[PDB]
Amino acid sequence: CDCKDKASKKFSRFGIQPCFICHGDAQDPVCLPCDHVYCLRCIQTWLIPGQMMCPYCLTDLPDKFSPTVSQDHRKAIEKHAQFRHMCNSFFVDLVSTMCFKDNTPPEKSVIDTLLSLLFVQKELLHREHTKSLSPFDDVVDQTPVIRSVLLKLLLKYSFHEVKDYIQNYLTQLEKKAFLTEDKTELYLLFISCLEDSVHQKTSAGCRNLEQVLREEGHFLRTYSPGLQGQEPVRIASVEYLQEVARVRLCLDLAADFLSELQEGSELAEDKRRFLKHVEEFCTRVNNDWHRVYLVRKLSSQRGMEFVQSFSKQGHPCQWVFPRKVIAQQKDHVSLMDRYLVHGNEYKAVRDATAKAVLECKTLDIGNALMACRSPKPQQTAYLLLALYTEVAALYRSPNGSLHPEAKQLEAVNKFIKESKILSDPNIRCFARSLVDNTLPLLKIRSANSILKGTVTEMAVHVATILLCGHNQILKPLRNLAFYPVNM
């Protein structure tokens, strides 16, 4: 600190200061006759009423904020800013490396002074900001920001000895910064920092899978609920967020085991016991937000059709779903139409193509196609992809299989013979193969039956793009898809 201040007097004649208004470094620096460096925006929004005087030393400025210094103050503020950045990088490197060297934690009062040097307490004028680990006072953010660097560097130790310190930091942030605001974001940040700390204390530690499975099982079957304590509006102990993060990793492990379970064989009689304990835990408590977390993790790791395959009627993994979502779910759970990426002009033509599927009138697709901008290549792609998604949603489903053969291929073929939008002989030789199911991409014969759908979708999408796209940077790939003897 006194290195910095004797540095500033060496730099620019006794005291480059931040502006008293903004509490930060000056932009377009105006100098008072009393050696004051202020912001230009702050002095134009401040000096124009009847306060032609000084905020700091109460000195009357005579004329106007006319002296700007285009020689001294930009390079002075530049050098002092480079110096404060280098010194704050120095301080954060020292508290990262030397204050936290080995497995024993530092003393109490040094941790208290680190947590107290984050605050810039009362000064006569916005009070009580939060700064980016600086040993100085003259750096500001005029919005209270909350980082996670000290939180991760305190939680490299055992959790049993750093509960009260982060708890006291939490009580300080609640009493001065986050009184009545969105505490959900800070609580999720704390849950994420504790779960990252347990990831580090398990993965960088050296122990086998059986001991960690036995101890998390012993956590499960001895879990007192106790949720009435840290519930209502403000009470959030670090033990409570540690319990929620620990059960989130238990459900993460259980969801990894279920994703392993569906893909392969039996789970060696001990992972079975762990999944049984996860089942007993989730069927004991009605805190089904954690079950929502389980289904969000399984939807994230594998896909939507994965939990659709879980959502059948007698699979022995049905307990991973809440009680209301299964009784009001039918067996006609159709698939997602990923081609709405085009948006608001493919949606109209696919709705009208579903209309011409259900009825026999085929002019509706032509009316929807003339109700669209964005011309001829994308329009042809919309029409061909709409025809694909309708004949695919018919042929896949067991109830309505082979529906355009029921006197309806005559109507769409009449639309082919009438409308010149797709009766180009390469588009036409594609479309004849797509109407009567004689395109050899539906018979891709992948026996997994979940990624098989995706592979069919990617193949017909890139074929639709290569046909409908009249583009130079598609001229090789067309030769890769229709002339392999010429390749």
CA 370 to CA 420: how far, in whole Å? 13
Q: How many angstroms separate the CA atoms of 75 and 330, rounded?
A: 71
Which residues ranging from 382 to 421 are in contact with another protein (CB under 8 A)?
A: none
- Which span (11-19, 208-216, 263-271, 321-329) binds another protein, by CB under 8 A? 321-329
Q: Tell me whether residue 39 or residue 349 sits nearer to Zn ion (CB atom).
A: 39
When asked if residue 180 is in the footprint of another protein (CB under 8 A), the reply is no
Residue whose structure tokens are 């949720």: 227
Q: How far apart are CA 26 and CA 177, in angstroms?
A: 26
Exposure of 306 in the CB half-sphere (CA atoms within 13 A): 20
Determine whether the annotation assigns residue 1 to a binding site.
no
User: What part of residues 5-24 is at the interface with Zn ion (CB under 5 A)?
Assistant: 19, 21-22
Answer yes or no: are the C-beta atoms of 28 and 70 closer than 8 Å. Answer: no
Q: Which long-range contacts (CB under 8 A, 24 or more apart) does 94-98 make?
A: 95/133, 95/153, 96/153
Residues forming a β-bridge with 130:
119
105 is an interface residue for another protein by CB under 8 A: no
Closest CA to 172 of 194, 139, 146: 146
241: amino acid identity, one letter: L
Which of 114-122, 168-176, 230-238, 399-407 is the region at the interface with another protein (rule: CB under 8 A)? 230-238
Where is 105: in which H helix or E strand?
none
Residues 332 and 399 sit within 8 Å (Cβ to Cβ): yes
Q: Do 265 and 238 meet the contact criterion of CB atoms below 8 Å apart? A: no
The single residue listed with the structure tokens 């699979």 is 315
| Binding region for another protein (CB under 8 A) out of 38-46, 92-100, 188-196, 434-442 | 188-196
Interaction partner, residue 353 (Zn ion, another protein, none; CB < 5-8 Å by kind):
none
Under rule CB under 8 A, residue 333 binds another protein: yes
Q: Which is nearer to Zn ion, 123 or 231 (CB)?
A: 123
Q: Considering beta carbons, is residue 38 or 281 the nearer one to Zn ion?
A: 38
Contact 115, 150 (CB under 8 A): yes
Please, which residue, 118 or 320, has the CB nearer to another protein? 320
Residue number of the CB closest to Zn ion reads: 19
Q: Minimal distance in Å, beta carbon 364 to another protein?
A: 17
Is 155 near Zn ion (CB under 5 A)? no
Q: Does 451 bind another protein (CB under 8 A)?
A: yes
Residue 328 interacting entry, from another protein, Zn ion, none, C-beta within 5 to 8 Å by type: another protein
Burial 357-394 (b: 16+ CB within 10 A, else e): beeeebebbbebbeeeeeeeebbbbbbbbbbbbbbbbb
> Which of 16, 30, 37, 39 is the binder for Zn ion (CB under 5 A)?
39
Task: Give me the 289-318 binding string for another protein, x by CB under 8 A, dash otherwise.
Answer: xx-xx-xxx-xxxxxx--xx--x-------
339 binds another protein (CB under 8 A): yes
Q: Using CB under 5 A, which of 16, 42, 236, 412 touches Zn ion?
A: 42
Q: How many residues lie near another protein (CB under 8 A)?
A: 73
Question: Does 31 count as an annotated binding residue?
Answer: no
42 is in an annotated binding site: yes
Residue 276 binds: one of another protein, Zn ion, none (C-beta under 5 to 8 A by kind): none
What's the min distance (Å) between Cβ of 168 and another protein? 20
Q: Which residue from 132, 138, 116, 159 is spatially nearest to 19, judged by alpha carbons?
A: 138
Spatial distance between the Cα atoms of 309 and 449, rounded to a whole number of angstroms: 11
Closest CA to 300 of 251, 342, 247: 251
- Residue whose C-alpha is closest to residue 453's, from 342, 335, 346: 335
| Candidate residues 240, 257, 395, 482; the one interacting with another protein per rule CB under 8 A | 240
DSSP 421: T
| Binding track over 247-286 against another protein, x by CB under 8 A | ---------------------------------------x
Q: Which positions touch Zn ion (CB under 5 A)? A: 19, 21-22, 39, 42
Annotated binding site for Zn(2+): 19, 22, 34, 36, 39, 42, 54, 57
